[model samples]
Target: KAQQEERLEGINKQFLDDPKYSNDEDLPSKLEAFKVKYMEFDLNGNGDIDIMSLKRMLEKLGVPKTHLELKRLIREVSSGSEETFSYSDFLRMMLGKRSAILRMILMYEEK
Candidate 1:
């Protein structure tokens, strides 16, 4: 048990620490694209992004998420409207999805 956990820790460390294996450093550059993409759509003058607009933006980015994919994201972020995409969680899903999901799996396993 200890050996497996120690291995997980080492794996996690190397995943983040080694640049070759992690294109993670490129994430900021990619995230910057989000702002550019989301900006025109925020046409409402509010910071909150509409899911429909984001859907169109993602469509251009070649990331056309399914309808189910969208609702799931909105519900996870705001727990309110299926129409709204909360700012922070939107980025997390777009940028940190891999990192976040990996961490989540590890956290769940440990628990």
Candidate 2:
């Protein structure tokens, strides 16, 4: 794991630790319910959740954005126009939309 800080690493490491995710197949463990349901959004098997997924995400979230606005978000998700969004990046971005939910999708706590 190279093992620097176990801080959020434990949680993040579990992200794709399940072999199925690497193959973009299935999810990891739960209490027989919905624990690692993030895989359900991996529509393209790209390992990272992507643009179209976020489009559907916006729909479900009832969060609307213009095409260019969405593009700016996609850019924020990546260095530039990246379709796939890693969990780390997603979590970090949440801090931008502070005091809310794309939003609080990955925020742990606040001060």
Candidate 3:
């Protein structure tokens, strides 16, 4: 879990630092915004992201409502039987792939 947390923190820093996604001041704000967004989908308030939470975050980020492709992608990424997508898992899901990460930023910026 420590490694995962470290990785996630690094990813968060990267997201905040990336000019395409956030400006310097906006970067700090985005962290709290992300936490709020995460909590909104955390129905059980467990501080963990289940599939439902993941789906909702995707939707909130402006993924097309009709995009079933992401659902399959999520399943594949989650690798089944993992009740929750840790912060690290979510970072991987969003930013692990270069193409997908760029697409996600574009989609998010469009919103």
Candidate 4:
């Protein structure tokens, strides 16, 4: 378990440090992009993404939004005190998600 957690943390750090998502100029653009993405996910326009919206978004991305995993990941990634997530927070979360997915793919291919 400790090894797994350490590996995950290393992956997370690498993801956060990637230029594609971590570049300074990219921040504003990524924030806007995430807003559009979020709106598409939030079909009900409730201003908050619940599990239903999250599931749909994940499906559209060709991924599974495991309920418990998402809840834990969201809470872990959140930068705010509020229960709800903001656009920036979501962007960060998505970057991490994409990184993990890509890493998994690479692992599968032994790359």
Per-residue lDDT tens digits of candidate 1, residues 1-111? 355334334434544455543557655444444444444345333455677777887888899987678878778766448777744444445555445434433222332
**Tens digit of lDDT per residue, candidate 2, span 1-104?**
12222423454456546443444322222211122333335534334566676777787788876556766777766753456665445534432222332332
Clashing pairs in 4: none
110: Cα error in model 2, Å = 22
Residues 1-111 of candidate 4 have per-residue lDDT tens digits of: 355334334444555567766645444444444444454444333345565566666778799867677777667777653344544465565554333444323213233
Superior candidate under lDDT, 1 versus 2: 1
TM-score of predicted structure 3: 0.36
Better of 2 and 3 by TM-score: 2
Report lDDT (Cα) of residue 18, candidate 4.
Answer: 70
Q: What is the C-alpha lDDT of each candidate?
A: 0.54, 0.47, 0.52, 0.52
Native-referenced Cα lDDT, model 4: 0.52
Over 4 Å off, model 3: 1-40, 51-81, 106-111
RMSD of each: 15.7, 11.9, 8.4, 13.1
Candidate 3, 1-111: lDDT as tens digits: 455445446657767766655534444554444444444445434445666666776788787433355556655767443455655355445443234434434334432
Give the 10-residue window scoring lowest on summed lDDT in candidate 2.
26-35
The worst-scoring run of ten residues by lDDT in candidate 4 lies at 102-111
- Which model scores highest in lDDT? 1
